[PDB]
Design a protein around this nucleic acid. Structure first.
Ligand SMILES: [Mg+2]
Ligand SMILES: [Mg+2]
Ligand SMILES: [Mg+2]
Ligand SMILES: [Mg+2]
Ligand SMILES: [Mg+2]
Ligand SMILES: [Mg+2]
Ligand SMILES: [Mg+2]
Ligand SMILES: [Mg+2]
Ligand SMILES: [Mg+2]
Lengths: 157, 120, 205
RNA sequence: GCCUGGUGAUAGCUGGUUGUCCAAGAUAGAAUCUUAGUUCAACUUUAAAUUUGCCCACAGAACCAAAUCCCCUUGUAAAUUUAACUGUUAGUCCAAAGAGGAACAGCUCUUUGGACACUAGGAAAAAACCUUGUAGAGAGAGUAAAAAAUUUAACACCCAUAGUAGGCCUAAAAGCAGCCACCAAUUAAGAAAGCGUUCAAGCUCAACACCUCCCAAACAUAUA
RNA sequence: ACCUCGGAGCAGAACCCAACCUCCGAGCAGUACAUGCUAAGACUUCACCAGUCAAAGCGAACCUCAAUUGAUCCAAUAACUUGACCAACGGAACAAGUUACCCUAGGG
């Protein structure tokens, strides 16, 4: 058999013993190492500007709609100067403690959309929400005073 | 082709790590080697068979004294895979004519010039 | 011309003198064309072998199929088939000279780059059809970037510096430690035990 | 034809060659009607005479790799010459460098080195691999080589409007028959990466909101 | 298809190294007529045979090429010399086809 073959040629036995003795040994540490120890500021400036803007705020669980249905809700609230805002609560949890909202820290989680306002059409917004047997009103906060949904009935009325 | 193998000189240059490992001093080195054949000349080329005959190592496991001079070291470099080399260390002096008969080369590598058979 | 040009079966000028199959044109690390030259991606050979014409058509055909010429260009690194491999007539008895020239071949050693790629393309784009191509080759090959090439060479340096094994093949072979050049090649003093025949051992330090 | 004689024809071919014990002893070749053989050489053997042999260090050996030659020291004990003759040669295998062949062959041909045609131990058995050589007796001891190790492939849950059925070509080909730009709206979904339709409409993806009959038996735990 | 001789690779660096291995060639021509005579020392195709180189000397002037070839005996010649594709090229002085009728001694 030639020195170059098509199959891996069988080594001489001392060749093979050399190859086994001179194998690579990796280092072993005494302790395993794994067992040892722009858009963000766009949201901060934008939503922080929305904090100082609104006198009244409300919020819902606006995930339970269709696209054209959210277009209808977008137009029926476009009829007012109220604004709706889908934004991550991931950044909104440091937003509240920045804006000194300690009663609003247990408010903003899961799917939610802001209803920031200065003029309450929120009674008529409830009039739009009464025809759909879901999507409840989550509590707001006008001028560092919290609004329960009962408070939305009282203030909205 | 299988040929006679030159070995480069960097192989025979000790490092201070090796002076920490074995018991050697680069200044004031040893005079005499003890060489022992520990491997067969069978299945070895004829030149290695010859060098084993020149150094006087035909019988295995029998120590032989040599000089630590570059000629003898050249022959030892040819058959360094068949032999074992240790420095002949001498705790007491080299033996005088009084102590010539009563010697014994111990296993350690030392050659004691008074070999009683009593315990210390 | 951002495509693979046609590689002919045999050059225009023939080679009238027959050649001995010096298979040491497959053995060992390649010297020619190991690094990139105005390329970004290649098909590195992890082993040696012979390229036929049919291999060259597998690469030209199955690369120029799936290739954006406005985004990607490509260069042959391995030349045209120039080594005349002979075959004797089928079922004829031995002796009577050396057989007539059958077909030409290129030798490719290990560490050779075969086909360079270039242009406005990421590596993950070009992994696919260069892995298909790299599997259709006769030898073990691999699609390699520039950063992946220097990555695995730095890995080989890490292996050569990290190992807690006092005995390497280089220290044993070159010193002739266990009388072991009786079993080794004279090439094993320069291959350093990473090449056996035409193969390549990447895992072996 | 057969018989007797020549005739113990001749046979480079086959077969066979009878006490004991010890010793030394194996692989270049050149010619040849030659390759089933001989002759010379090489190697081998005995006897004799003498003086170096072997290993080798610097220096040194050509232009168009491994090494070798040469070689004082040194380590050794052989070498050359003289006399006299026989015998042996298609060696085989392994490692290496190659050639022919299919980078087949227990295939063919060279080179270097081993081993075998010489012992014993190991590798299942075992010419050629590894360990090991010089011979006897021992119901002592220390060692050498020396026991195959492995077992694999889960994967992001969502979520999708609008300029628009992007222009041109195309019966229309709309992100998806092709060219080109590939901007833009909300907070954000590509003038589109895969199904899909003549074309559509419908489905996913990125991104948004939560994140002939198997073949030792066996055995994972006690300090090398 | 070949049989002798030489060059190159194989066979990289002293010498040597095969193949019905890879490629080139040779079987002469030309010039000179001291291409006279002698002679230390050497090389050598792995033997022998053949081959090569050569200082000094006497005598005179003032070979190129790689191979370029053939033993002994016998002939021819007064002598000096000359004599083979003896190419199967170490050459028998001169001898073809075939045998399922073959035969014998052996080998696979
Ligand atoms: Mg007879
Ligand atoms: Mg005969
Ligand atoms: Mg004997
Ligand atoms: Mg003849
Ligand atoms: Mg014969
Ligand atoms: Mg000398
Ligand atoms: Mg000679
Ligand atoms: Mg003849
Ligand atoms: Mg002849």
């Amino acid at each position: 058999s030639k020195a170059v073959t098509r199959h891996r040629r069988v080594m001489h036995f001392q060749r093979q013993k050399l190859m086994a003795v001179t194998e690579y040994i990796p280092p072993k540490p005494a302790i395993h190492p794994s067992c040892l120890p722009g858009l963000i500021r766009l949201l901060r400036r934008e939503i922080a500007a929305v904090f100082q803007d609104n006198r009244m705020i409300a919020v819902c669980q606006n995930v339970a709609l269709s696209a054209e249905d959210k277009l209808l809700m977008r137009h029926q609230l476009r009829k007012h100067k109220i604004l709706m805002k889908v934004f991550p609560n991931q950044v909104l949890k440091p937003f509240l403690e920045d804006s000194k909202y300690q009663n609003l820290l247990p408010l903003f989680v899961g799917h939610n959309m802001l209803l920031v306002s200065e003029e309450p059409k929120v009674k008529e917004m409830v009039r739009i929400l009464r025809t759909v047997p879901f999507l409840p009103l989550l509590g707001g906060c006008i001028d560092d005073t919290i609004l329960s949904r009962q408070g939305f009935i009282n203030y909205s009325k | 082709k299988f040929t006679r193998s030159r070995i480069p000189e960097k192989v025979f240059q000790a490092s201070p790590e090796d002076h920490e490992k074995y018991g050697g001093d680069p200044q004031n080195p040893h005079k005499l080697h003890i060489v022992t054949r520990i491997k067969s000349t069978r299945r070895r080329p004829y030149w290695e068979k010859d060098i084993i005959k020149m150094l006087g190592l035909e019988k295995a496991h029998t120590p032989q004294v040599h000089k630590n001079i570059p000629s003898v070291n050249a022959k030892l470099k040819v058959v360094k895979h068949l032999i074992r080399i240790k420095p002949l260390k001498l705790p007491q002096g080299l033996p005088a004519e009084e102590n010539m008969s009563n010697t014994c080369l111990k296993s350690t590598g030392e050659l004691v010039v008074q070999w009683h058979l009593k315990p210390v | 011309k951002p495509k693979l040009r046609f590689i002919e079966r045999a050059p225009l000028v023939p080679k009238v003198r027959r050649e001995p199959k010096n298979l040491s044109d497959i053995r060992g690390p390649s010297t020619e064309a190991t690094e990139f030259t105005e390329g970004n991606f290649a098909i590195l050979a992890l082993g040696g072998g012979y390229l036929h014409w049919g291999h060259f058509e597998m690469m030209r055909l199955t690369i120029n199929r799936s290739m954006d010429p406005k985004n990607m260009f490509a260069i042959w690194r391995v030349p045209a088939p120039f080594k005349p491999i002979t075959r004797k007539s089928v079922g004829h008895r031995m002796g009577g000279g050396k057989g007539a020239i059958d077909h030409y071949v290129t030798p490719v050693k290990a560490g050779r780059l075969v086909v360079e790629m270039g242009g406005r393309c990421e590596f993950e784009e070009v992994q696919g059809f260069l892995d298909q191509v790299a599997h259709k080759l006769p030898f073990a090959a691999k699609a390699v970037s520039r950063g992946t090439l220097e990555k695995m060479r730095k890995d080989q340096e890490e292996r050569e510096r990290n190992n807690q094994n006092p005995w390497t093949f280089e220290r044993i072979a070159t010193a002739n430690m266990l009388g072991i050049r009786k079993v080794l090649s004279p090439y094993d003093l320069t291959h350093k035990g990473k090449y056996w025949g035409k193969f390549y051992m990447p895992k072996r330090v």
